[PDB]
């Protein structure tokens, strides 16, 4: 044809060839099964026997084991090998999904449809599924006309737009390494392809990636090039699906990496760019005169990434500056802030003999810090080593080497996110050009899902917090989507919303007195501490709300916690240590007030522009900034029809074709999926049209299917006879206005009889 030309056509759907092969395999629907196996997930066996409540089966392996039934899983016939949307398997289970991914997998088909989500397996490799060529293949065809892919999702999201007037929205979830990033740069690529009728808004949309990846990336032991902050990005678009604008949003980005590397890892990419020898003179411009792996702050671990080039990322992030329309002193002014930052790290102190007082251990370091703040060097120290309180007369309070140390760190991280959020509001402002209405938008969502590690913090509380909001939000449209299904075809069971399953939780989080005000109260409480907070908590929850549990004994590896709470993807032990410093976020406000009357550097003065100084002054908390981000991302998205996109990280050593058959499964049954199949499954999995149905199985009742001119009548009068032959209940189905609604495990054994018959 055309589409079996493209070369990624081999990479989206096999060949008749390879399905007859796939489909000629021995099978038996009552002897085939899948039994649960420590090394595998599941593994297929052979039912040699049964006696009673247990069955006897002789495995892929060979050996023989004696279950209980409860335990075995059906397989499905190998028809649907490699099934591209999975709600069409004959039996819907956990292993049965496992099996379908792991198939398409082996085949490098990265994508696989479960009902409302888009699954895709990052494939550590080059596809080449992402050309123009095949982008023009999905543009205006049928979702169900399609193999899947990221690209059918994405152009349906638009012809709903357009065709429904509505906004959309794409969520991308996933681990880190899944392949997030990857998802979220094509679908905006696909989006700026379809909605383009000297240099255009989607070249600068695109140019965005290497300024934010510089400053917002970084090696991480899960992925060479992780985003280390959640995203929204709306694509706005006018009546008639022209591009007209794009903004960003930016969610907790990660401040501690700019002062500390764990083993195996980088800082972000941006200050081995800058260090690169792509300019050579601008180390020398900054200051920078000693090798980068003296610098403490961007030093700690790993200085390279195999396989990144940091002269060549450097020229595209410095030549985006350029496109976004930063100007030659801004994108300097940058630079210099950046060089501040390594500089910052190496400045040295010390306490002379029964000293508290910290002064400089020489001053090379904080001269050349200062000439990039464009500030004196001995107001910088002071400030630093002596900064002034008031108290209605300014006192100098005295730091010692751990309080100036703590002081730098804080400066250095609270200054360097205040530099991303004016990138970010500085593409904003490039990316919003006069021209075309902004009559609908599609609001792309890329931010990790939940976490569960040894130790789980502030920083972790929030993650985990937004995916029970998310969660609850599929939840939500799936539940509204099959109630509105069911009212429109006339057959309205009541059921209860499947958000409501997360709300428990949520509430124990955002409810008066719930986790994070009980923080906001306390934070702000003279002599309160980190354990102040910590039983007031258990004393306010422990025994009486059923999600919050006192914590287990530090197994394995587990640090000490002060409470655990029951989140959709587990019981998570959360130590509340440095918590009410994490909400208020202080800075040395001296420093900060010797940065703002800066000369010598305009950008310095313009970041600080949201601080307010004690003497400009003369609450709002981190949590009620993050309380009011999260609320007004939900209000958005359930503005919006959304589409849901879980990437699967396969195994733990970037290995292209490996399954590590634990990590899937784990990611499966906290992501949603397992947990939609079975909702799925506990409903009507299927649905046919009267006159399909009638043709489908005319044969095993031909008189009934010809009885009536009305095709719901002759599908009624079929049902009828089946259920008086026995060989259906009248609980197994449901007849709608339009479509016969079939409960699990039915369709399957209208096929068996069908297929027997023929
Ligand atoms: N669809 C894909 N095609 C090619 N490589 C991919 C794909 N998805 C992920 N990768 C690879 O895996 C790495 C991690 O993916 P990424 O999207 O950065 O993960 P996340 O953003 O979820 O942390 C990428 O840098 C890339 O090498």
Redesign the pocket.
Known sequence: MEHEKDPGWQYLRRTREQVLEDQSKPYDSKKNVWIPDPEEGYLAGEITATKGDQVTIVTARGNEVTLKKELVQEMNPPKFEKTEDMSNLSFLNDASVLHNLRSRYAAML?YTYSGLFCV?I??????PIYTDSCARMFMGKRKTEMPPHLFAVSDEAYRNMLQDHENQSMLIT??????????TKKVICYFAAVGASKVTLEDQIVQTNPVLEAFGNAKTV??????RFGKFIRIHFNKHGRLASCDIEHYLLEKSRVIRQAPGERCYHIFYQIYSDFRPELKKELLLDLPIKDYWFVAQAELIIDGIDDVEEFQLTDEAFDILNFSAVEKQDCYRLMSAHMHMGNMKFKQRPREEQAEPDGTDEAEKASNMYGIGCEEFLKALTKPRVKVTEWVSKGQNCEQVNWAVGAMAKGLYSRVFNWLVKKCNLTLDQKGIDRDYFIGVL?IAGFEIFDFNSFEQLWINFVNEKLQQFFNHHMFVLEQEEYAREGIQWVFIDFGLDLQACIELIEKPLGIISMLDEECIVPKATDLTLASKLVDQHLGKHPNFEKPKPPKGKQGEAHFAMRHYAGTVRYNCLNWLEKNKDPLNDTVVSAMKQSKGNDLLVEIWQDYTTQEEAAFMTVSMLYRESLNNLMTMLNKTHPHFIR?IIPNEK?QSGMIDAALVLNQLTCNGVLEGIRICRKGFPNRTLHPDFVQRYAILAAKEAKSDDDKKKCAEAIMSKLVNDGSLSEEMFRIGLTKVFFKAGVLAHLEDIRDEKL
């Not at 390494?177 to 990857?182: D, L, S, V």
């Not at 899960?222 to 985003?227: I, K, L, M, T």
């Open positions: 990265i895709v990052n494939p550590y490799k080059r596809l996933g681990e880190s390494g899944a392949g997030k990033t990857e998802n899960r992925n060479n090039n992780s985003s890329d990437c970037k």
